[PDB]
Amino acid sequence: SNSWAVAPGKTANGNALLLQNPHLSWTTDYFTYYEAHLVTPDFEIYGATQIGLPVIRFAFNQRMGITNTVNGMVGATNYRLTLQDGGYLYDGQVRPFERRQASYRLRQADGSTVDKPLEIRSSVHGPVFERADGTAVAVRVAGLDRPGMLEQYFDMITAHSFDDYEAAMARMQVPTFNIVYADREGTINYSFNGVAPKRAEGDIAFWQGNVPGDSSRYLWTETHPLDDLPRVTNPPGGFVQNSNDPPWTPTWPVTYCPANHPSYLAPQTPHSLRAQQSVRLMSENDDLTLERFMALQFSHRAVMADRTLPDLIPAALIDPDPEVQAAARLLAAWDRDFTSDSRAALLFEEWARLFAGQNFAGQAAFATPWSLDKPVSTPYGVRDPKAAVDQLRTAIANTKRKYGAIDRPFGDASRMILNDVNVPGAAGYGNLGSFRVFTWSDPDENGIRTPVHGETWVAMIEFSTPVRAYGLMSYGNSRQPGTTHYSDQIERVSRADFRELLLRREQVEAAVQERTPFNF
Amino acid sequence: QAPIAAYKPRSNEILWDGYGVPHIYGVDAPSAFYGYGWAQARSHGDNILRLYGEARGKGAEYWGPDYEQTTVWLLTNGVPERAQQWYAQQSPDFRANLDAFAAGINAYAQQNPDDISPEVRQVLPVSGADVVAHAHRLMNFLYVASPGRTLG
């Protein structure tokens, strides 16, 4: 997911700008987003939220707006238990488990149900589970005593001022997510939100693994207040951003550093190329207009190519295999952008899968390692060009095997297909540097692939008076069998032809195609 | 300076645009949430009822083995029962919105039974607590504590 909030001073018209851009599976039911607009005499809200949720998570109105990205807040701890004499060893003594005998029904093939016993065991840590390898794990989830998640989101999005907004957030009822905010008053904010356990030792890596469940030494009981978490408001840089990267470059120049917070709050790992693009696109541009803002969101640069081809090409050209040479020239003439007509893109991806792993996050192959001191220009170069060329050799075979040729047009293989709509794809993997994301699936027998995750709800809003906003939903606003609103937006997505979002009554009335009166 | 004058809805109605986007107008908060529930049932009823069914801890009961692992995960973590607690712990004002939302979903199914897949009809009617249960499952037991990380 991506998120941008731009301050008035960094814009041409003097109004804040906001980008809602969450990335999630295109098929997972509980991850499906839904667009809606609610209006009462006291409040108005427009935006997307996951189906089944009564509150809009990605919302905005005439006053304010927010967006979310996953930050992976470590709100739970998995403890490894030391079983002994029917119980578990804790602080030098064998403790008995709390045991509750429950049951649930299991539907049978003939429609009937079978009553099935379920023993629920718990240690002081929390519920206990047994892994396939036989490891006994107790999961301790924080924030189980925070029933106001939904109401907090509601009060946040209907807030009349940033102060009221922060007061709502301070309730600490939303257990996770990075949240970005912007309003018509000109304030922008980035918050590394979530319910984080207070711990006296151990870095994030330690707490993400199996923590020793045999000592009260690791049994936390309190959580951090909103003031203890990384946050930024109206920074000198005039913007805030987050593309799932650790919260160490939320703006430029930064306003804090890793040493300013406990080391278990967030990783200090290399920022993805997509995140580096996010920072560059905002910091390098000034006097932004809503139009330019949108154009920037469409960025689909093969940043990985800029960091590797300078070293890879010359090495490949000296290889005896003429096919490797031809591949080197193909890659060399590429403008390094994931456009539909690119004949080198698919081949580059295949190479990168080997050079940087299947998720393209590998760091071992670069010559210059990532550095927070050069957060948007590292890692760089190819450490071992010889090996890299052997990797290209293998990539050449993989590309031909998957797509039928080493120079098949990107958009000919990459398609967005919903119902009977089949359009050419563009943009691509975020870890390769593409800001606009489409995580292409593996290709089928004919080399055709489609998005499995990526752009879903995308909206850019300018807080002028009245506000102006544009948006699109990749997979439509409905998935009910037979609906005409599942594949009716994908064609516009393929051309980045955004819909103006309608908040004003007059606009809605002019666009209405169906009226549903109702009574409660 | 001041925002544009707000609209004062004088009747409850949903105005749908050409892309299936519902513009829900309510004379008060409960009415709007009701319309929102109706709209979501219209656009995504089948999967929502299915998800609510799982959050109740009745996935295995309603649909079989393919939903048994999640049932065991949610029951062991006491999600359905905690949802009942969180629901009761809601402020009166907000609980009325959750009740209205659930009522909107039930009303849509009532007026449009043909749009509800046979397999999920047994889930109805839904309640405010069901809405809380799903949200609780999604936030705490999907995003924060996933079964994958605990079980491996």
User: What share of the residues of chain B lie within helices?
Assistant: 55-70%
CATH class of chain B: Mainly Alpha
Question: Can you identify the CATH class of the largest domain in chain A?
Answer: Alpha Beta
Helix content of chain A: 10-25%
Biggest sheet record of chain B: 2 strands, antiparallel
Report the β-strand fraction of chain B as a percent range. 5-15%
The whole-angstrom Rg of chain A is 25 Å
Overall body shape of chain B? globular
The number of distinct structural domains of chain B comes to 1
Query: What Rg of chain B do the Cα atoms give?
Result: 17 Å
The proportion of residues in beta strands of chain A is: 25-35%
Active site (chain A): 1, 23, 455
Protein name (chain A): Glutaryl-7-aminocephalosporanic-acid acylase subunit beta
Organism (chain A): Brevundimonas diminuta (Pseudomonas diminuta)
PDB class: hydrolase
Describe this structure in words.
The complex is a heterodimer of chains A (520) and B (152). Chain A has 520 residues and is of the alpha+beta class. Chain A folds into three domains: 1-75 and 142-267 and 451-511, Aminohydrolase, N-terminal nucleophile (Ntn) domain (Glutamine Phosphoribosylpyrophosphate, subunit 1, domain 1, 4-Layer Sandwich); 270-450, Penicillin amidase (Acylase) alpha subunit, N-terminal domain; 76-141, Aminohydrolase, N-terminal nucleophile (Ntn) domain, beta-sheet knob region (Penicillin G acylase, beta-roll domain). Chain A is 22% helix and 27% strand. Chain A is built from twelve helices and 30 strands. In chain A, the strands form nine sheets. Chain A has a six-stranded antiparallel sheet with strand order 20-1-2-27-28-29. In chain A, strands 7-16-17-19 form a four-stranded antiparallel sheet, with no helix packed on it. In chain A, a hairpin with a 5-residue loop joins strand 27 and strand 28 (468-473). The longest helix of chain A is centred in the last third of the chain and has 19 residues, at 385-403. The two termini of chain A are 37 Å apart. By secondary structure, chain B is mainly alpha-helical. Chain B has one domain: Orthogonal Bundle (Penicillin Amidohydrolase, domain 1). Helices cover 61% and strands 6% of the residues of chain B. Chain B contains seven helices and two strands. Chain B has a two-stranded antiparallel ribbon. In chain B, strand 1 (13-17) and strand 2 form a beta hairpin. In chain B, helix 1 (29-55) packs across helix 5 (92-111), helix 1 (29-55) crosses helix 6 and helix 4 (79-88) packs across helix 6. The longest helix of chain B is centred in the N-terminal third of the chain and has 27 residues, at 29-55. The interface between A and B is large, with 90 and 96 residues. Strand 4 of chain A pairs parallel with strand 2 of chain B, so a sheet runs across the interface.
